[PDB]
């Protein structure tokens, strides 16, 4: 097996299937995106970037619920990108379709929150296909429970970003997240465990090559995977509280399907 080549295939699949990558995001976050830092600028951004949403219609819903709807749309788009990426992970398409569904169900949010780090800095996050920037303080200013969604993701991201990974690393980390043999309800556990071992070995060797300065980067990343599982379990609980208690926050059917019976 050619492990440098497997790494390259996974990296190429990640550049092809995600609209946002870390170099792009840094090109933009340097310098311009429209800054959402208060309710006035939120409303302006809605009219320029999500015009249909407020061409009348939910325009009369609370700002928090409008933002939540836009976030659901973005997650729907990201699940599609992750599915295309997964299908290009060597070996994934040969798994039983039931196992492909299970791995996606449990992996997508861990991958989402890992990738979200690439568009975050300590002051905010790049959104809307690179055309907006929403401040961390604005999100904290929203009414409960909506102000409680993003702050743990910024906290994860600041420390994840301090590892100074690039897209060649992150692509493999996302593949390792997806190709996880301990998800509940897998059918061919042994096959998936061997696929996992293979991807994790590709990751280990790549980090040795690409980060010779950081001898602990591989175990640091294993710990980040465990941190992400916890972050998703907590996020799912918060989403359940929102869907149950906020009537204008009904879940899009694809997201309901992912969260249903997850944790």
């Amino acid at each position: 097996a050619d492990l440098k080549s497997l790494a390259k295939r996974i990296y190429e699949a990640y550049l092809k299937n995600f609209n946002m990558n870390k170099v792009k995001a840094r090109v933009i976050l340097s310098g311009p995106p429209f800054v959402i830092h208060d309710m006035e600028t939120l409303c302006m951004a809605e009219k320029t970037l999500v015009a249909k949403l407020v061409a009348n219609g939910i325009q009369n819903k609370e700002a928090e619920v409008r933002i939540f709807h836009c976030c659901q749309c973005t997650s729907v788009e990201t699940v599609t990108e992750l599915t295309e990426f997964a299908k290009a992970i060597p070996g994934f398409a040969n798994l039983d379709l039931n196992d492909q569904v299970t791995l996606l169900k449990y992996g997508v949010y861990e991958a989402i929150f890992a990738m979200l780090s690439s568009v975050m800095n300590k002051d905010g996050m790049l959104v809307a296909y690179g055309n907006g920037f929403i401040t961390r303080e604005f999100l904290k200013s929203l009414r409960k429970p909506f102000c409680d969604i993003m702050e743990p993701k910024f906290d994860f991201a600041m420390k994840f970003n301090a590892l100074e990974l690039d897209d060649s690393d992150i692509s493999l980390f996302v593949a390792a997240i997806i190709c996880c043999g301990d998800r509940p309800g897998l059918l061919n556990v042994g096959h998936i465990e061997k696929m996992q071992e293979g991807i994790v070995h590709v990751l280990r060797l790549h980090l040795q090559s690409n980060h010779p300065d950081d001898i602990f980067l591989f175990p640091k990343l294993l710990q980040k995977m465990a941190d992400l599982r916890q972050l998703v379990t907590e996020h799912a609980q918060l989403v359940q509280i929102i869907k149950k208690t906020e009537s204008d926050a009904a879940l899009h059917p694809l997201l309901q399907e992912i969260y249903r019976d997850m944790y």
Binding site: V79, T80, T83, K87, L97, N98, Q100, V101, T102, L104, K105, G185, P253, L254, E257, I258, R260, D261
Partner: peptide, 13 residues
């Protein structure tokens, strides 16, 4: 479980 995830199944197909 493909039966319980028709929308994910459609993305995979």
């Amino acid at each position: 479980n493909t039966k319980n995830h028709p929308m994910l199944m459609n993305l995979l197909k």
